[PDB]
């Protein structure tokens, strides 16, 4: 009952990170590219099974509505504990308990978003509640709960 334009913009931004060539469909090559940049090694066949789950029109790729469907199913069903820890591990690359400004910058570049260094620090200071210029695990969890 509505959908806001920034909600639409958020979905478009996510979709466009996978759809690297901007043709409106995500292939196994593209899906694999993102997952590989985040430290994973899916086979071609596994990637195809991922598409198949949501490929409503049967053409072998994911369009925008099919990707929305994917987020509804996968980006919310599991995810509570011991796997939010996996997500933080992606951010906290070296594994010292603290996401530095540079480590955050490294995740954004691997996703596809090549934001400026200034914008990276704007994110840090947003989630940085204890003043040390970094984001520990607890501040990460609280950042995920707010608007």
């Amino acid at each position: 009952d509505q959908l806001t334009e920034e909600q639409i913009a958020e979905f478009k931004e996510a979709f466009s990170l996978f759809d690297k060539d901007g043709d409106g469909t995500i292939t196994t090559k593209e899906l694999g590219t993102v997952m590989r940049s985040l430290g994973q090694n899916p086979t071609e066949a596994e990637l195809q099974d991922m598409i198949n789950e949501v490929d409503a029109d049967g053409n072998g790729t994911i369009d925008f509505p099919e990707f929305l469907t994917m987020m509804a199913r996968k980006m919310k069903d599991t995810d509570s504990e011991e796997e939010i820890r996996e997500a933080f591990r992606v951010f906290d690359k070296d594994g010292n308990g603290y996401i530095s400004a540079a480590e955050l910058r490294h995740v954004m570049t691997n996703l596809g978003e090549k934001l400026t260094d200034e914008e990276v620090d704007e994110m840090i200071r947003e989630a940085d509640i204890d003043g040390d210029g970094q984001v520990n695990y607890e501040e990460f969890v609280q950042m995920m709960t707010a608007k």
Partner: peptide, 19 residues
């Protein structure tokens, strides 16, 4: 507030998809 939740969502989605 768009930056954090977007990066988190895609990381979490990729984490879920690999099984």
């Amino acid at each position: 507030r768009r930056r954090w939740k977007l990066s988190f969502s895609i990381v979490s989605l990729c984490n879920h998809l690999t099984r």
